[PDB]
Amino acid sequence: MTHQTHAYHMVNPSPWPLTGALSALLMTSGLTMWFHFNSMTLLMIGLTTNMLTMYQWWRDVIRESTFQGHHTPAVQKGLRYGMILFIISEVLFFTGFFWAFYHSSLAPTPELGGCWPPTGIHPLNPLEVPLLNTSVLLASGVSITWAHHSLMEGDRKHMLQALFITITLGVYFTLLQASEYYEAPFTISDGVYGSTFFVATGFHGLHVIIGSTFLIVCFFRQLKFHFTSNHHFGFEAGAWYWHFVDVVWLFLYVSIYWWGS
Amino acid sequence: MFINRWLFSTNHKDIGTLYLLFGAWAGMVGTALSLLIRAELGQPGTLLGDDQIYNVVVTAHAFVMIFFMVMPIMIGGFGNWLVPLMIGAPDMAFPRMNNMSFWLLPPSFLLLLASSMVEAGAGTGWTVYPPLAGNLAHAGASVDLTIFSLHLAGVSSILGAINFITTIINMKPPAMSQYQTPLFVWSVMITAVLLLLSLPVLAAGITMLLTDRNLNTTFFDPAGGGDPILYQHLFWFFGHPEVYILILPGFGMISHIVTYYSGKKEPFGYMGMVWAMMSIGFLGFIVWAHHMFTVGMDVDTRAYFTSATMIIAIPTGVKVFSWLATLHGGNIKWSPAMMWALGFIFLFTVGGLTGIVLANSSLDIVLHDTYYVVAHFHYVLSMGAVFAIMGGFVHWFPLFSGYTLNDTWAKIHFAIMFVGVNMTFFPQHFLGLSGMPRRYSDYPDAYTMWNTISSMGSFISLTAVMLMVFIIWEAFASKREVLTVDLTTTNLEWLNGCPPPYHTFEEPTYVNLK
Amino acid sequence: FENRVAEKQKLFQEDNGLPVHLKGGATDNILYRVTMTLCLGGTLYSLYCLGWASFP
Amino acid sequence: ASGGGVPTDEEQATGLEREVMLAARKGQDPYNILAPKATSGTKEDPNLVPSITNKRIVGCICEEDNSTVIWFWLHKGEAQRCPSCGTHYKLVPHQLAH
Amino acid sequence: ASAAKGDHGGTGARTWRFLTFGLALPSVALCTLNSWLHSGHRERPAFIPYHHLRIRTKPFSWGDGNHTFFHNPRVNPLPTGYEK
Amino acid sequence: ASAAKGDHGGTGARTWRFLTFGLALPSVALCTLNSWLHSGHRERPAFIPYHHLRIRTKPFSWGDGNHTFFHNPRVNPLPTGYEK
Amino acid sequence: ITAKPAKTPTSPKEQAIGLSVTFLSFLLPAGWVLYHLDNYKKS
Amino acid sequence: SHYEEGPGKNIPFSVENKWRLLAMMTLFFGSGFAAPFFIVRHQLLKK
Amino acid sequence: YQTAPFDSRFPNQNQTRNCWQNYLDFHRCEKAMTAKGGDVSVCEWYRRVYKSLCPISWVSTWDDRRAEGTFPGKI
Amino acid sequence: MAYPMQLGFQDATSPIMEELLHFHDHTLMIVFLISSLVLYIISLMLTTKLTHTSTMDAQEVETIWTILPAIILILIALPSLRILYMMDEINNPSLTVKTMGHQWYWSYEYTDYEDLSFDSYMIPTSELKPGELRLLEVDNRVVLPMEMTIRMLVSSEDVLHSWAVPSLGLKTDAIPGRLNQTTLMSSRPGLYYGQCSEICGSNHSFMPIVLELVPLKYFEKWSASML
Ligand code: HEA
Ligand code: HEA
Ligand SMILES: [Cu+2]
Ligand SMILES: [Cu+2]
Ligand SMILES: [Cu+2]
Ligand SMILES: [Mg+2]
Ligand SMILES: [Zn+2]
């Protein structure tokens, strides 16, 4: 009593949960304005307060762990579980989209021409840029691993070098994918093929951007000596998320880009 | 101060209280909606109007009771309040995130309220199936708002599911195995896993529905080659686990209540009980299609789903029989909570037995979309999930508040509600066997008797939920402070007195490693 | 490069009875108020829009 | 490869993290991260329950495979016994607390 | 289609840095060249007003409400036909 | 078709013994019953001297050199036709 | 479960008041809206 | 923590005056039960 | 001819393809007997079946699609 | 149709519906057995002053109560599945009618030979002739030949709808872009009512189904006078 004798973390009252909850309200209702009464001001404010919340909520977490030392071993083991579990819910999110795809491509309705890809659709070639995007993502898988190993071996320069290479490959994929979208001879509106394609590869795209800003954050935390050769969960997570991202692309490639086209 | 405590919390007890408050209020809205439903059906004719205004009411009834009363109360309320106390944890693994879970709820509720105001609301059914939910048959912001409300409520529940699993797994005393935690904790740890795996598929489904009606996609539109049935699969893949997610924490509370008032140390067959919930949770993931028997699927697959659905009776059976075995040599105390526990055991049995009937695709052909299925789920929800909530509420109220309830009044409240719900839902078995469809604002003259009796019962229930509010007031008005609690040796939640201090287990708990 | 986590550890461990989200200075405070302001205002604005859209 | 540059816990760990780090190397466990090992539990060899106050909740897993932990407050004073199996427990002042 | 190859039993950072520059990056270069060589610009596909394509049940929330987001006029026709 | 289920974070022998008798074995029992119920004895398939079947380029190293190893006369015809 | 006597007991009259009030607060608003249904259905 | 403890103090509403409480509970649960009625009314008065 | 008989390749509750297949089949046969003459022989069977099973609106729209050349099936 | 104060199923107009009544009786007999067993055990447990609060051995009795429910489930499953296949059985229909759900009316199409098609709408309770059923009468009944195997094909031209006729033990959803099939086979003449069994908008409750079954002879003359 008074002084605690358990290794856990009693976090100080934060206004951030309220702030982020309000943010969700603003973005959701804001999308409703954009979609219906053609307005984005509300959507803009929501995106704003949301970034503000994430910045601060994560800034504090850094403060509490790196500056204040609350991340004892027990606290860390809990963060590992949390991340795993989160990645899991994500894996099941993408599963709705592969279900959708397979459902459509395995039993093509007559309005499509009773075939797959539907008549009128000119699928991209898996052997062209899709093949490139694949090799880029896969390489960042090996380079992020090199980064992880340098970090554990206390090799500051190399961890930085590998983390940098990894980050640029992630960006390279983003640009490449962006151009593919623009050059694609089909759109979201091109029936079920376009729907199925643009939302699955699209949500994944959003995830590569989310994973890249995460690695960027890790980059700077390292420039500032935040990570020790032994305590760098922020990186472990960034790394786990990054792999989830290659893997999802492997399924996308094989399913949508290769098999279903 | 108030702000810091109530808006900026990181306390499992306070967040849990905030939930119970949200759930009770939402419970009022849902009750009002259920009364308009029976008001409309209590006399042949139309009171409100067309199946649109009526079905808007039926839809909000479902969303409110499922997502805003039952889930917040059982998982967020009792979950946050009791879990840490039962495993000897100082709090939860992610105190801050835990708060966001709660605060995501009021906005979510707003979006749902907003949906029924703009345009003509959402008269789609809680399943919000397309084409009816589409931008043609349901143009306007309504359905979109219904969808966004569901997104938030889902984000809220999987964030909390993440918290409970981490806490429950990672924050028990070092010498305590998982096979040493109480059934309630197991009950929410398992419910937490179902939420983690089912909720995302729903979000995948309704996001596809959202794009279909705002971004010109055709996931469920035949024109583009879509399939309205695809939505049914996605929805129901979540839709079934969802009902177990709704009864599991109830199973747990019941195990605690029956054992306590039987004067027993522990429940009969503890490991059988753990096995049972785990089986129930698992089989619950491979039976979704029993909700699609009249959709045009292959006879073979239709056969698979009726069988798979039926084996769930076995584990559920070991639980019913275990609670009975628990009462066995007990020194029974006829307390209000024990009354709720007994009702649950019977009523839930009847309602689940009635669900085995519907498990049969052949018979379900003529039973689907009728009031028989409305009877089935109200038995397991109105006198199953809800009875557990009441038993748990009256049993733990002193722990949460420090004050006691007037037991006699509390017993009167059971009597009234027991009569009310049975009178309301019993007749409905007939209306359904005899053909009265679901989601109708009016019915052929023949169905008049049962619909009348049914509606009268709903008024008795109204009386009971009014009395309860009073019962809570009186408790707080009189202020009889708790002194002594029985069987604390085997019930940790009570060891820190009523109410436990803001900070419990500041200095851990000592548990030997034999 | 630098490495001055040691200065910040000290700054944040300082017993000034401040909550972590403010323990870092004046900017923490302005950021806080800006965020809080935008959220509340936005929330007010949203309620207005809904009241407005509720009507034909 | 080759080189160096990243901090170590021994040199950069702070707060409670550091406290358990050091405490752990001295073989002691002030923040109860480990499971306390039982004594014979006889009146003469009671289990010694350290505490930072004058009472601590003791949970007794009477028999190895038991699913029910017996809970109770252990107070400062004479050795006390688990209500279900005797087994003596005696409170003791908690040393290291930083 | 491979099976595997040169085992180097001990993997540390030197090994991963070796794979990065000795395998990973060289592949990204080859494929880049490949994709830079197979850069055949396909002539915009023949327009035929199929009903299962160019779907429009609600005008898009932007522009003239008839233009998809990453609209490329060269290869994407409007429902009516190619842009210009 | 599942997703997963009841997590019990700590796995020791008790957990695996629990899965063995509480999951593994019960499944073997169900499927056993299933296969014991679907035990429909198919009537021996119609014989038609297809050339791509009952291949014989070298008599088998046993018996009359025309009988496959696990020969079941009820359902396996010789090249000429069913045994008897 | 034992408890100390009420610090501020609620006499029957007091209960009768709280019970009546609790009822009215539920029954009135609904009753009013329901009482005027036809007026709404006829504009 | 300057957070007060004990019966009647671990809640976000005052329980010190039974009648002020009566009022609050009445508005709280009351407004919740009335909402659906007024929404239906609102929908019935549109065109 | 009474009505389209049971078709083994379409043994389940869903007949969508049954309607679809025969509609194609007929028009595919028709086009051939035309571009071959072969005494302008005619594949009536398929038309009897597809007319029985396919709801009017589908046949209509398909015919129109075939008219403007936006019919997705390959004939 | 359904009469006042009815408890169970509408009388079976067809053989599978008869088959169902018997299966339900079987299934219901069991739910009565179990539900009364549980109630007896419960009252038994709560009726003695004798106590035994010490530990009790589980598992032993745990087999009885796990193997028993398992046997009972087979006793229901078997009959259920048989009827299930019996419904999706290889039959050869002598007629094919199509029905298309629409937002607030069904339309039928008899097109085996001639292109006969009409709309079936509910008769406003206001224009009902004495003796006519309030929310069940339709203006154009779907006429069909009694004692014959008909093949119904259900679909919709808009939202989802569900075509059902309880007396015949039929219910098939109407999904746009889909052709669901069902076998109708009444073994007796008459008027057989049903209703839309799927939420489809404002008048979901007001789009009934009325089957009128007469002998072939009268069926064909009706068919012709219909165009
Ligand atoms: C908490 C709520 C809850 C619970 C626990 C259940 C439990 C079950 N339900 Fe469900 N059900 C609902 C709520 C619930 N249900 C809802 C909301 C709907 C409608 C949704 C909608 O479409 O809108 C519905 C719909 C529904 C349908 C589809 C109806 C239709 O055609 O539309 C089916 C069919 O399989 C079904 C079956 C079952 C079964 C087999 C169980 C089993 O879990 C029952 C298990 C219990 C027992 C079996 C009794 C105890 C055990 C014994 C005493 C052992 C001995 C007994 C035997 C051997 C039989 N339910
Ligand atoms: C939690 C689930 C839940 C509960 C408890 C209830 C309770 C009630 N529901 Fe139900 N209902 C549904 C969920 C629920 N319902 C769903 C999912 C549907 C399907 C919708 C669709 O078809 O799309 C449905 C459909 C439905 C219908 C069918 C309409 C139709 O299809 O045409 C009817 C009609 O009678 C109805 C009536 C009622 C009634 C009379 C009550 C009464 O029993 C209510 C009694 C009041 C209570 C039991 C609440 C009191 C409890 C509290 C307020 C908690 C208090 C808090 C604390 C103690 C802290 N409901
Ligand atoms: Cu289900
Ligand atoms: Cu309809
Ligand atoms: Cu309908
Ligand atoms: Mg249905
Ligand atoms: Zn002991």
Verify G-A touch: 3 or more CB pairs within 8 A.
Answer: no
**DSSP SS3 for D37:** strand
CA distance J41 to B224: 58
Tokens matching residue F66:
């025309």
Candidates 3.40.190.10, 3.40.50.300, 1.20.120.80, 3.40.50.261; CATH matching A71-261: 1.20.120.80
3-class secondary structure per residue, chain I: CCCCCCCCCCCCCECHHHHHHHHHHHHHHHHHHHCCCCCCCCCHHHHHHHHHHCCHHHHHHHHHHHHHCCCCCCC
> What is the rounded CA–CA span in Å between residue B144 and residue B124?
12
Q: What are phi and psi of J170, to 5 degrees?
A: -120, 150
Amino acid at B21: L
Task: Please say whether the beta carbons of B69 and B110 come within 8 A.
Answer: no
Which residue of I lies nearest to A112 if distances are taken between CA atoms?
Answer: I72
Cα-based angle D3, D9, D11 (whole degrees, multiple of 5): 80
Two structure tokens written together for H9: 């103090």
For H17, other C-beta atoms within 10 Å of its C-beta total 12
Q: Rg (Cα) of chain E, in Å, rounded?
A: 23
* Separation in Å, CA of A101 to nearest CA in chain C: 36
Omega before E26 cis (within 30°)? no
3-class secondary structure for B413-444? HHHHHHHHHHHHHCCHHHHHHCCCECCCCCCC
Structure letter (DSSP) for residue E52:
T
| A25 in Cβ contact with B110 (< 8 Å) | yes
Q: How many CB atoms lie within 10 A of CB J116?
A: 16
Task: Suggest the residue from C1, C3, C7 to mutate for an interface test with chain D (most D CBs closer than 10 A).
Answer: C3
Distance CA A46, CA A53 (A): 10
Q: After which residues is chain I broken (C to N over 2.5 A)?
A: none
Compute the distance from residue D89 Cα to the ligand 7 centre, in Å: 10
Kindly give the pairing relationship between strand D70-75 and strand D86-93: unpaired
**Cα–Cα–Cα angle for C24, C30, C35, rounded to 5 degrees:** 110
What count of other Cβ atoms lies within 10 Å of the Cβ of residue A243?
16
The DSSP H or E segment spanning A130 is: helix A129-152
The single-letter code of the amino acid at A69 is G
Q: What is the token pair recorded at B34?
A: 């259920």
What is the set of domains in chain J, with CATH numbers?
1-91 (1.10.287.90), 92-227 (2.60.40.420)
CB neighbour class for B337 (10 Å; exposed up to 12, middle 13-18, buried from 19): buried
Number of domains comprising chain H: 1
- Name, in order, each residue with C-beta under 8 angstroms of E16's C-beta and a sequence gap of 6 or more: A142, A143, A145, A146, A149, A162
Q: Check if CATH label 1.20.210.10 holds for domain B1-514.
A: yes
CATH of E1-84, one of 2.40.50.100, 4.10.95.10, 3.40.605.10, 3.40.50.2300: 4.10.95.10
Give D21 to chain B, closest Cα distance, Å: 18
Which 3-state string (H, E, C) describes chain J?
Answer: CCCCCCCCCCCCCCHHHHHHHHHHHHHHHHHHHHHHHHHHHHHHHCCCCCCCCCCCCCCHHHHHHHHHHHHHHHHHHHHHHHHHHHHCCCCCCCEEEEEEEECCEEEEEECCCCCEEEEECECCHHHCCCCCCCCCCECCCEEEECCCCEEEEEEECCCCEEEEEHHHCEEEEECCCCCEEEEECCCCCEEEEECCCCCCCCCCCCCCEEEEEECHHHHHHHHHHCC
Which of B267, B266, B307 is closest to B283 using CA atoms?
Answer: B307
Q: Identify residues after which chain B is interrupted (C–N over 2.5 A).
A: none
| Alpha-carbon distance values, E76 to A130, A201, B212, E60, E73 (Å) | 20, 19, 20, 16, 5
Structure tokens at F50: 């297809």
* Structure tokens that stand for D19 in this block: 């406290």
Atom 32, ligand 2: residue with shortest CA distance:
B439
Per-residue DSSP letters for B258-277?
Answer: HHHTTT-SS-TTHHHHHHHH
What is the distance between the alpha carbons of residues B199 and B153, in angstroms, rounded to a whole number? 10
Rounded distance, CA J201 to CA J204, Å? Answer: 5
Contact assessment for residue A63 and residue C23, using Cβ atoms and an 8 Å cutoff: yes
Is the Cβ of H2 closer than 8 Å to some Cβ of chain C? no
Question: For helices B336-359 and B299-310, what crossing angle results, to 10°?
Answer: 160
Query: What strands, in cross-sheet order, belong to the sheet with B510-511?
Result: B510-511, D55-60, D70-75
Which is it for strands D47-51 and D86-93: parallel, antiparallel or unpaired?
Answer: parallel
B219·A100 Cβ contact <8 A? yes
Distance, CA of J204 to CA of B447 (rounded, Å): 17
Q: Is G38 exposed, middle or buried (0-12, 13-18, 19+ CB in 10 A)?
A: exposed
Q: How far apart are CA B222 and CA J177, in angstroms?
A: 6
Distance CA A134, CA H37 (A): 57
Q: Which residues line ligand 1 (CB under 6 A)?
A: B 243, 246-247, 290-291, 293, 309, 312-313, 316-317, 320, 349, 352-353, 355-356, 358-359, 364, 368, 373, 376-377, 380-381, 384-385; J 34, 69, 72-73
Query: Edge-to-edge, what's the strand order for the sheet holding J116-120?
Result: J116-120, J105-110, J95-102, J150-156, J180-184
Task: Write out the residues surrounding ion ligand 7, Cβ under 5 A.
Answer: D 60, 62, 70, 82, 84-85, 87
Q: List, as one string, the DSSP characters of C35-55.
A: HHHHHHHHHHHHHHHHHHHH-
Site to probe by mutation for ligand 1, drawn from B373, B378, B386, B433 as the one with most ligand atoms within 8 Å of Cβ, is B373
**Residue D1 near chain A (CB below 8 Å):** yes
Placement of tokens 């923040």 in the chain: D31
Q: Which three-class secondary structure state does DSSP give residue B112?
A: helix
Structural domain range at position H32: 1-47
CA distance A114 to B225: 9
Chains near I, with 3+ CB pairs < 8 A? A, B, E, J
Active site residues of B: 61, 91, 126, 156-157, 240, 242, 244, 255, 290-291, 316, 319, 438
Give the C-alpha distances (Å, rounded to integers) separating B216 from B213, B236, F43.
Answer: 6, 24, 54
What resolution in Å is listed for this PDB structure?
A: 2.8
Report helix, strand or coil for D93.
strand
Whether B190 contacts F5, CB under 8 Å: yes
Which has the closest alpha carbon to B271: B162, B177, B195, B388?
B177
Ordered DSSP codes for A191-250: HHHHHHHHHHHHHHHHHHHHHHHHHHHHHHHHHTT---SS--HHHHHHHHHHHHHHHHHH
F5: three-class secondary structure by DSSP? coil
Specify the residue for token string 């190893």: F69
Alpha-carbon distances, residue A170 vs A147, A155, E17 (angstroms): 15, 23, 18
Residues A182 and E72: beta-carbon distance below 8 Å: yes
Question: Which residues contact residue A216 at a Cβ distance below 8 angstroms, ignoring those fewer than 6 apart?
Answer: A167
| Nearest one of B26, B19, B149, B25 to B76, comparing CA atoms | B19
For residue A255, give the nearest of A117, A113, A109, A110 by alpha carbon. Answer: A117
Pull the structure tokens for residue F71: 């020969």
Q: Which residues contact E49 (CB under 8 A, 6 or more apart)?
A: E79, E81, I68, I70
Which residues, listed in sequence order, are joined to residue J171 by a DSSP beta bridge?
A: J164
Output the CA–CA distances (angstroms, integers) from residue A2 to A132, B84, H6, J50, in the order listed: 60, 19, 17, 48
For A138, residues 6+ apart whose C-beta sits below 8 A from its C-beta are A246, E24, E27
Question: Taking the C-alpha atoms of I64, I69, I70 and I71 in order, what is their torsion angle to the nearest 10 degrees?
Answer: 70
Distance from first CA to last CA of chain J, Å, rounded? 29
Which protein residue has the closest C-alpha to ligand 2 atom 30? B439
Tokens at residue E18, please? 């070796």
- Tell me yes or no: is domain C1-56 CATH 2.40.50.140: no
Residue J153 CA to residue J155 CA, distance in Å, equals: 7
Residues B375, E34: Cα–Cα separation, whole Å? 65
Method for this entry = X-ray
Largest CA distance in chain J: 84
**Are the C-beta atoms of A205 and A177 separated by less than 8 Å?**
yes
Q: Domains along chain D?
A: 1-98 (2.60.11.10)
The CATH number for I71's domain is 1.10.10.140
Chains in contact with chain C (at least 3 beta-carbon pairs closer than 8 A): A, B, D, H
Containing D73, the helix (H) or strand (E) segment is: strand D70-75
Range list of H helices, chain E = 13-19, 25-37
- Choose one of B187, B246, B309, B380 to mutate for the ligand 1 pocket test, by most ligand atoms within 8 angstroms of C-beta: B380
Task: Give the Å distance between the CA of B192 and the centre of ligand 3.
Answer: 18
User: Within 13 A of B249's CA, how many CA atoms are on the CB side?
Assistant: 32
Among positive and negative, which fits the CA dihedral J126, J128, J130, J134? negative
Task: Tell me the residues of chain B between 280 and 299 that have a Cβ less than 8 Å away from chain J.
Answer: 294-296, 299
J207 annotated to bind ligand = yes
Helices in B171-298 by DSSP H: which ranges? 183-212, 228-260, 270-283
**Is B194's Cβ below 8 Å from some Cβ in F?**
yes
Which residues fall within 8 angstroms of residue A227, CB to CB, at 6 or more apart? A151, A221, A234, A235, D6, D7
Overall number of domains in chain I? 1
Taking CA atoms, D57 is separated from A2, A108, B489, D24, in Å, by 16, 65, 10, 24
Task: Map residue B495 onto helix, strand or coil.
Answer: coil
For residue B425, how many other CB atoms are within 10 A of its CB? 24
Q: What helix, strand, coil percent values describe chain B, rounded to 5?
A: 70, 0, 30
Asked if B319 and B275 touch (Cβ cutoff 8 Å), the reply is no
Nearest Cα to Cα of residue H37 among B43, B111, B34, B467: B34
Ligand nearest the Cα of residue J71 is: 1
Broken C–N links (> 2.5 Å) in chain H, after residues: none
CB-based contacts of E41, cutoff 8 Å, min separation 6: none
Rounded Cα–Cα distance for residues D22 and D29 (Å): 10
Distance from C-alpha of A140 to C-alpha of A172, rounded to nearest angstrom: 11
Report how far residue J163's alpha carbon sits from residue J155's, in angstroms, rounded to the nearest whole number: 9
8 A C-beta contact, residue B311 and residue B267? no
E79, amino acid identity: P
- Number of Cα atoms under 13 Å in the Cβ half of residue J108: 22
Beta-carbon neighbour count of residue D93 at 10 Å?
11
Measured on CA atoms in the order B409, B413, B415, B416, is the torsion positive or negative? positive
User: Nearest chain A Cα to D10, which residue?
Assistant: A228
The DSSP H or E segment spanning B511 is: strand B510-511
What is the distance between the alpha carbons of residues J22 and B196, in angstroms, rounded to a whole number? 42
Asked if residue D62 belongs to a known ligand binding site, the reply is yes
Cα–Cα distance, J198 to J106 (Å, whole number): 13
To the question of whether residue D85 is assigned a binding role by annotation, the answer is yes
Partner J contacted by B90 (CB < 8 A)? no
Strands J161-165 and J170-174: antiparallel
- In terms of residue numbers, what domain contains I30? 1-75
* Domain A1-70 = CATH 1.10.287.70: yes
Chain J interface includes B21 (CB < 8 A)? no
- How far, in Å, are B49, B437, I29, J9 from residue B442 at the CA level? 10, 10, 52, 20
Q: Which chains touch J (3 or more CB pairs under 8 A)?
A: B, I
| Preceding amide of B131 cis, omega within 30 | yes
What domains can be seen in chain G, in order of their start residue?
Answer: 1-43 (4.10.81.10)
Tell me the C-alpha distance between A144 and A162, whole Å: 6
SS3 assignment for D41-69: CCCCCCEEEEECCCEEEEEECCCCCCCCC
Q: Dihedral sign for Cα F58, F63, F64, F67, please.
A: negative
Domain regions of chain A by residue span: 1-70, 71-261
Question: Sign of the CA dihedral B395, B400, B404, B406?
Answer: negative
**B302: amino acid identity, one letter:** R
Instruction: Give yes or no for a cis peptide into B106 (omega within 30° of 0).
Output: no
